[PDB]
Design a protein around this motif. Structure first.
Motif, PDB file in Angstrom:
ATOM      1  N   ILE A 124      39.070  31.399  -5.484  1.00  0.00           N
ATOM      2  CA  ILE A 124      38.667  30.173  -6.231  1.00  0.00           C
ATOM      3  C   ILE A 124      38.836  28.770  -5.729  1.00  0.00           C
ATOM      4  O   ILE A 124      39.988  28.597  -5.340  1.00  0.00           O
ATOM      5  CB  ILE A 124      39.403  30.630  -7.686  1.00  0.00           C
ATOM      6  CG1 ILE A 124      39.342  31.719  -7.974  1.00  0.00           C
ATOM      7  CG2 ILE A 124      38.858  29.432  -8.560  1.00  0.00           C
ATOM      8  CD1 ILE A 124      39.891  32.286  -9.388  1.00  0.00           C
ATOM      9  N   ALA A 125      37.827  28.170  -5.650  1.00  0.00           N
ATOM     10  CA  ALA A 125      37.756  26.448  -5.218  1.00  0.00           C
ATOM     11  C   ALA A 125      37.673  25.933  -6.600  1.00  0.00           C
ATOM     12  O   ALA A 125      36.815  26.261  -7.330  1.00  0.00           O
ATOM     13  CB  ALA A 125      36.835  26.093  -4.169  1.00  0.00           C
ATOM     14  N   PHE A 126      38.532  25.019  -7.112  1.00  0.00           N
ATOM     15  CA  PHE A 126      38.610  24.348  -8.305  1.00  0.00           C
ATOM     16  C   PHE A 126      38.952  22.844  -8.452  1.00  0.00           C
ATOM     17  O   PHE A 126      39.613  22.350  -7.431  1.00  0.00           O
ATOM     18  CB  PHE A 126      39.265  25.140  -9.287  1.00  0.00           C
ATOM     19  CG  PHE A 126      40.858  25.557  -8.779  1.00  0.00           C
ATOM     20  CD1 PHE A 126      41.000  26.584  -8.011  1.00  0.00           C
ATOM     21  CD2 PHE A 126      41.688  24.833  -9.322  1.00  0.00           C
ATOM     22  CE1 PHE A 126      42.525  27.030  -7.683  1.00  0.00           C
ATOM     23  CE2 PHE A 126      43.094  25.195  -8.940  1.00  0.00           C
ATOM     24  CZ  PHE A 126      43.214  26.266  -8.189  1.00  0.00           C
ATOM     25  N   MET A 127      38.504  22.285  -9.311  1.00  0.00           N
ATOM     26  CA  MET A 127      38.770  20.922  -9.211  1.00  0.00           C
ATOM     27  C   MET A 127      38.269  20.693 -10.963  1.00  0.00           C
ATOM     28  O   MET A 127      37.456  20.744 -11.392  1.00  0.00           O
ATOM     29  CB  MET A 127      37.586  19.846  -8.367  1.00  0.00           C
ATOM     30  CG  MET A 127      36.163  20.368  -8.880  1.00  0.00           C
ATOM     31  SD  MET A 127      35.087  20.257  -7.467  1.00  0.00           S
ATOM     32  CE  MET A 127      35.516  21.642  -6.329  1.00  0.00           C
ATOM     33  N   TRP A 238      41.578  17.287  -5.690  1.00  0.00           N
ATOM     34  CA  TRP A 238      42.002  16.439  -6.836  1.00  0.00           C
ATOM     35  C   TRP A 238      41.755  14.937  -6.516  1.00  0.00           C
ATOM     36  O   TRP A 238      41.653  14.732  -5.359  1.00  0.00           O
ATOM     37  CB  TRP A 238      43.749  16.590  -7.270  1.00  0.00           C
ATOM     38  CG  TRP A 238      44.407  16.310  -6.253  1.00  0.00           C
ATOM     39  CD1 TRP A 238      44.819  17.413  -5.154  1.00  0.00           C
ATOM     40  CD2 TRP A 238      45.090  15.002  -5.904  1.00  0.00           C
ATOM     41  NE1 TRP A 238      45.749  16.708  -4.138  1.00  0.00           N
ATOM     42  CE2 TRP A 238      46.055  15.295  -4.410  1.00  0.00           C
ATOM     43  CE3 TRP A 238      45.372  13.756  -6.292  1.00  0.00           C
ATOM     44  CZ2 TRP A 238      46.813  14.453  -4.158  1.00  0.00           C
ATOM     45  CZ3 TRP A 238      46.032  13.106  -5.849  1.00  0.00           C
ATOM     46  CH2 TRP A 238      46.766  13.227  -4.568  1.00  0.00           C
ATOM     47  N   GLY A 239      41.696  14.096  -7.452  1.00  0.00           N
ATOM     48  CA  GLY A 239      41.512  12.847  -7.323  1.00  0.00           C
ATOM     49  C   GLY A 239      42.508  11.869  -8.222  1.00  0.00           C
ATOM     50  O   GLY A 239      43.187  12.226  -9.049  1.00  0.00           O
ATOM     51  N   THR A 240      42.439  10.433  -7.979  1.00  0.00           N
ATOM     52  CA  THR A 240      43.313   9.365  -8.620  1.00  0.00           C
ATOM     53  C   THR A 240      42.148   8.370  -9.361  1.00  0.00           C
ATOM     54  O   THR A 240      41.466   7.908  -8.604  1.00  0.00           O
ATOM     55  CB  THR A 240      44.013   8.815  -7.556  1.00  0.00           C
ATOM     56  OG1 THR A 240      44.982   9.505  -6.861  1.00  0.00           O
ATOM     57  CG2 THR A 240      44.685   7.736  -8.185  1.00  0.00           C
ATOM     58  N   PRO A 241      42.557   8.456 -10.663  1.00  0.00           N
ATOM     59  CA  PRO A 241      43.615   8.866 -11.205  1.00  0.00           C
ATOM     60  C   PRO A 241      43.134  10.238 -11.866  1.00  0.00           C
ATOM     61  O   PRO A 241      44.086  10.791 -12.738  1.00  0.00           O
ATOM     62  CB  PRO A 241      43.717   7.928 -12.519  1.00  0.00           C
ATOM     63  CG  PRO A 241      42.066   7.326 -12.627  1.00  0.00           C
ATOM     64  CD  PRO A 241      41.664   7.333 -11.369  1.00  0.00           C
ATOM     65  N   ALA A 251      49.915  17.870  -8.049  1.00  0.00           N
ATOM     66  CA  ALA A 251      51.126  18.020  -7.337  1.00  0.00           C
ATOM     67  C   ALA A 251      51.959  19.251  -7.802  1.00  0.00           C
ATOM     68  O   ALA A 251      52.388  19.980  -7.080  1.00  0.00           O
ATOM     69  CB  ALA A 251      51.972  16.832  -7.018  1.00  0.00           C
ATOM     70  N   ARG A 252      51.972  19.434  -8.985  1.00  0.00           N
ATOM     71  CA  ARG A 252      52.964  20.595  -9.664  1.00  0.00           C
ATOM     72  C   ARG A 252      52.199  22.071  -9.414  1.00  0.00           C
ATOM     73  O   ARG A 252      52.721  22.907  -8.977  1.00  0.00           O
ATOM     74  CB  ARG A 252      52.805  20.360 -11.176  1.00  0.00           C
ATOM     75  CG  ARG A 252      53.859  19.315 -11.733  1.00  0.00           C
ATOM     76  CD  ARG A 252      54.076  19.608 -13.465  1.00  0.00           C
ATOM     77  NE  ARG A 252      53.138  18.969 -14.112  1.00  0.00           N
ATOM     78  CZ  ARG A 252      52.623  17.805 -14.418  1.00  0.00           C
ATOM     79  NH1 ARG A 252      53.563  16.934 -13.941  1.00  0.00           N
ATOM     80  NH2 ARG A 252      51.702  17.335 -15.092  1.00  0.00           N
ATOM     81  N   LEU A 253      50.789  21.863  -9.379  1.00  0.00           N
ATOM     82  CA  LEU A 253      50.089  23.034  -9.131  1.00  0.00           C
ATOM     83  C   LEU A 253      50.119  23.485  -7.585  1.00  0.00           C
ATOM     84  O   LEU A 253      50.278  24.453  -7.206  1.00  0.00           O
ATOM     85  CB  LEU A 253      48.651  22.823  -9.350  1.00  0.00           C
ATOM     86  CG  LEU A 253      48.364  22.645 -11.191  1.00  0.00           C
ATOM     87  CD1 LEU A 253      46.859  21.954 -11.442  1.00  0.00           C
ATOM     88  CD2 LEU A 253      48.430  24.065 -11.725  1.00  0.00           C
ATOM     89  N   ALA A 262      45.779  22.438  -1.253  1.00  0.00           N
ATOM     90  CA  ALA A 262      45.547  21.258  -2.330  1.00  0.00           C
ATOM     91  C   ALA A 262      44.997  20.051  -1.397  1.00  0.00           C
ATOM     92  O   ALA A 262      45.618  19.758  -0.331  1.00  0.00           O
ATOM     93  CB  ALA A 262      46.588  20.750  -3.277  1.00  0.00           C
ATOM     94  N   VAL A 263      43.806  19.641  -1.745  1.00  0.00           N
ATOM     95  CA  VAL A 263      43.193  18.448  -1.177  1.00  0.00           C
ATOM     96  C   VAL A 263      42.781  17.311  -1.608  1.00  0.00           C
ATOM     97  O   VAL A 263      42.162  17.276  -2.926  1.00  0.00           O
ATOM     98  CB  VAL A 263      41.703  19.071  -0.479  1.00  0.00           C
ATOM     99  CG1 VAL A 263      40.839  17.892   0.143  1.00  0.00           C
ATOM    100  CG2 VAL A 263      41.964  20.203   0.516  1.00  0.00           C
ATOM    101  N   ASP A 264      43.268  16.180  -1.326  1.00  0.00           N
ATOM    102  CA  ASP A 264      43.393  14.812  -1.994  1.00  0.00           C
ATOM    103  C   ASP A 264      41.969  14.342  -1.664  1.00  0.00           C
ATOM    104  O   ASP A 264      41.730  14.004  -0.429  1.00  0.00           O
ATOM    105  CB  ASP A 264      44.317  14.098  -1.570  1.00  0.00           C
ATOM    106  CG  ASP A 264      44.282  12.559  -2.207  1.00  0.00           C
ATOM    107  OD1 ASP A 264      43.361  12.301  -3.159  1.00  0.00           O
ATOM    108  OD2 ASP A 264      45.152  11.770  -1.696  1.00  0.00           O
ATOM    109  N   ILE A 265      40.919  13.945  -2.520  1.00  0.00           N
ATOM    110  CA  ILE A 265      39.759  13.368  -2.349  1.00  0.00           C
ATOM    111  C   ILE A 265      39.394  11.813  -2.259  1.00  0.00           C
ATOM    112  O   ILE A 265      38.742  11.252  -2.083  1.00  0.00           O
ATOM    113  CB  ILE A 265      38.433  14.002  -3.258  1.00  0.00           C
ATOM    114  CG1 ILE A 265      38.485  13.495  -4.577  1.00  0.00           C
ATOM    115  CG2 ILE A 265      38.642  15.584  -3.032  1.00  0.00           C
ATOM    116  CD1 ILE A 265      37.320  13.073  -5.109  1.00  0.00           C
TER     117      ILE A 265
END
Ligand SMILES: [Cl-]
Length: 293
Positions: A124-127, A238-241, A251-253, A262-265
């Motif tokens: 599963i890839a999810f966002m 995941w992204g900011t904000p 980060a918890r996940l 986990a990949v920061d986009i």
């Protein structure tokens, strides 16, 4: 820049007496990758991600019932309706084992199907996914009063049904970079007739916020409990904000979910696909090559 075209040939399948449209590209054999969009999008949201995966894997991207190019019968479009049609779509295509790529209400469909059918989910890839929002303080402040207004049968329907605010306003406030007029016309197209806007209003009324609706909260809690123990390979973007998934939640996940990358986009709100499709697409393709599929 980011591609605005939707070059995919249409495919249609009859599902519970209704025609559902879906993208279907890539090689015919192998484990397919099933891409599920949410509100207020369609398979259009995957248009720049699919081309990174289609060279090596089958990509199937349906339009949810009532959305995109799928039929739009006069239903209430509760989550349960989407579950019935998506269960039947998967069976109508004869899919066996799949990899899921899921977003927003598509992630509730994907996680709920995965929890009920874990032997058929290879990854599963999810966002920006549906999780329980404990209180309204955990909904983004800049969008709090509007989503509270959306969740009423008077003001909420005036905004979403009569005035199309989820398309003309909320959608744009879910992407950091500006959408072009061409892109906006792709998103507007399924909903030119106000009578077809029911799913756009029912979806935010199904969001599990501050314990309401209790049935959706329970269903979502169930799949999140499964996700916290299951060995299924997981890829989180995941992204900011963010919107549904702020950085601290990501980060918890990332620390807690088993077998999770986990990949920061970078900058992102809800439609992370519209802010960094190249990273999402290329990371999915790399991650797929590590799976036993
Ligand atoms: Cl929603």
């Amino acid at each position: 820049g980011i591609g605005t075209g939707f070059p995919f040939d249409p495919h249609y399948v009859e599902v519970l007496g209704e025609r559902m449209h879906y993208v279907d590209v890539g090689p015919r054999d192998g484990t397919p990758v099933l891409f599920l969009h949410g509100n207020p999008t369609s398979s259009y949201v995957w248009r720049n991600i699919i081309p990174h995966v289609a060279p090596t894997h089958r990509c199937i991207a349906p339009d949810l019932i009532g959305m995109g190019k799928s039929d739009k019968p006069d239903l209430g479009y509760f989550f349960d309706d989407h579950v019935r049609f998506m269960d039947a779509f998967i069976e109508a295509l004869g899919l066996e084992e799949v990899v899921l790529v899921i977003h927003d209400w598509g992630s509730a469909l994907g996680f709920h199907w995965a929890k009920r059918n874990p032997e058929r989910v290879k990854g599963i890839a999810f966002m920006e996914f549906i999780r329980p929002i404990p209180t309204w303080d955990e909904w983004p402040e800049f969008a709090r009063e509007t989503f509270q207004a959306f969740r009423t049968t008077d003001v909420g329907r005036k905004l979403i049904i009569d005035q199309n605010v989820f398309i003309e306003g909320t959608l744009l406030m879910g992407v950091v970079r500006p959408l072009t007029e061409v892109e906006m016309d792709h998103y507007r197209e399924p909903f030119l007739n106000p009578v077809d806007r029911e799913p756009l209003w029912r979806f935010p009324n199904e969001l599990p916020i501050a314990g309401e609706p209790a049935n959706i909260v329970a269903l979502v809690e169930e799949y999140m409990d499964w996700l916290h123990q299951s060995p299924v390979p997981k890829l989180l973007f995941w992204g900011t904000p963010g919107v549904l998934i702020p950085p601290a939640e990501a980060a918890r996940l990332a620390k807690s979910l088993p077998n999770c990358k986990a990949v920061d986009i970078g900058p992102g709100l809800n439609l992370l696909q519209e802010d960094n499709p190249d990273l999402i697409g290329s990371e999915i393709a790399r991650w797929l090559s590590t799976l036993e599929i």
